[PDB]
Design a protein around this ligand. Structure first.
Ligand SMILES: Nc1ncnc2c1ncn2[C@@H]1O[C@H](COP(=O)(O)OP(=O)(O)OP(=O)(O)O)[C@@H](O)[C@H]1O
Ligand SMILES: NCc1ccc(-c2ccccc2)c(Cl)c1
Ligand SMILES: NCc1ccc(-c2ccccc2)c(Cl)c1
Length: 324
């Protein structure tokens, strides 16, 4: 394959000492698990259990994410990234890191967010509310990309919103990684519906722009009330769903530009598809959320070529946000 490099924040890690990005060498220090009283279970993740808790020293609510220690290197990575990003705009705050002695289990302690339900959001949110929260996510992405970090798991479940206080936090940094120009990354990242074409075609030299594709998927589902927008049933079918909207001609131009070898599993499923106009997804139920500025902004995010997508900073300057 042909090499690629990010158009922005290309060398931010190159120009910092190893301590910043070498998470494997990072020394993790535990807090006191006895400072936290678990209140209730909030839910269960792939390799984690999330609880609402009280910090008994200051009577503040916190969230405790109990990790199933499957890979130590991955836990060190999440911790180092959370420490590096601590205090950034709309980044979840890691308040503490604790361990249970007997069970020998690590846990991350976060600021608590009174999360407004997803199904309770996409019907009451206005055109303004969509622009407002999209801009809040862009603040978090431009910040983490400026800090040389790709989130790699942008999706609705990883965006906590306290609607009453118009407060947004980008969470679950467990798949995040440091961007190093020329580095070949694992493509088995992000959640199916939000995976960029780069991942689906096994193009490893990707960058922060992967997050901009995921953001585009979120925007499309919100303005069109079609959740998820690209409904793949497996990773191969996910590319077919994208190709049914973006068309197969541009898919091959992308493969040719980067000299990508297309997996034989695509042979019988990809077919031939024209490019669809964004206006065809407009209906009576969603027309109050769609505007020419909304469709122009979406068109500039949902592009096969990872290099041709708007950066988070370029996205923030789009006319779609003139009212926020
Ligand atoms: N910081 C947080 N504040 C509140 N709830 C959280 C937080 N982090 C994760 N969750 C919850 O954990 C679940 C996802 O795992 C969801 O129910 C989500 O609301
Ligand atoms: N003081 C009550 C209590 C008990 C166990 C844990 C715990 C569980 C798993 C991993 C780390 C800590 C915590 Cl956070 C609090
Ligand atoms: N935690 C679920 C959820 C629901 C809706 C949105 C949203 C809101 C406005 C614009 C785009 C997405 C987000 Cl960011 C998260």
């Amino acid at each position: 394959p042909v090499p690629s490099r990010a158009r922005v924040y290309t060398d931010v890690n190159t120009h910092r000492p190893s301590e910043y990005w070498d998470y494997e060498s990072h020394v993790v220090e535990w807090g006191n698990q006895d400072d936290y009283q678990l209140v209730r279970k909030l839910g269960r993740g792939k390799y984690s259990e999330v609880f609402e808790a009280i910090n008994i020293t200051n009577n503040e609510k916190v969230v405790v994410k109990i990790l199933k220690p499957v890979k130590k290197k991955k836990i060190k990575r999440e911790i180092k990234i959370l420490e590096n990003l601590r205090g950034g705009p709309n980044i979840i705050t890691l308040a503490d890191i604790v361990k249970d002695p007997v069970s020998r289990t690590p846990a991350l302690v976060f600021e608590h967010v009174n999360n407004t339900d997803f199904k309770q959001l996409y019907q009451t949110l206005t055109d303004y509310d969509i622009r407002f929260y999209m801009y809040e996510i862009l603040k978090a992405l431009d910040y983490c990309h400026s800090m040389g970090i790709m989130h790699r798991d942008v999706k609705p479940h990883n965006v906590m919103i306290d609607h009453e206080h118009r407060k947004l936090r980008l969470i679950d940094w467990g798949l995040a990684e440091f961007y190093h120009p020329g580095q070949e990354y694992n493509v088995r990242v992000a959640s199916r519906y939000f995976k960029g074409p780069e991942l689906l075609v096994d193009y490893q030299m990707y960058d922060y722009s992967l997050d901009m594709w995921s953001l585009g998927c979120m925007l499309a589902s919100m303005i069109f009330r079609k959740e998820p927008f690209f409904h793949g049933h497996d990773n191969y079918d996910q590319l077919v769903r994208i190709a049914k909207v973006l068309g197969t001609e541009d898919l091959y131009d992308y493969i040719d530009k980067y000299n990508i070898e297309l997996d034989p599993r695509f042979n019988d499923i990809l077919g031939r598809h024209s490019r669809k106009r964004w206006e065809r997804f407009v209906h009576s139920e969603n027309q109050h959320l769609v505007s020419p500025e909304a469709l122009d902004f979406l068109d500039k995010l949902l592009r096969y070529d990872h290099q041709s997508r708007l950066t988070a900073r370029e996205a923030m300057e789009h006319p779609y946000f003139y009212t926020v």
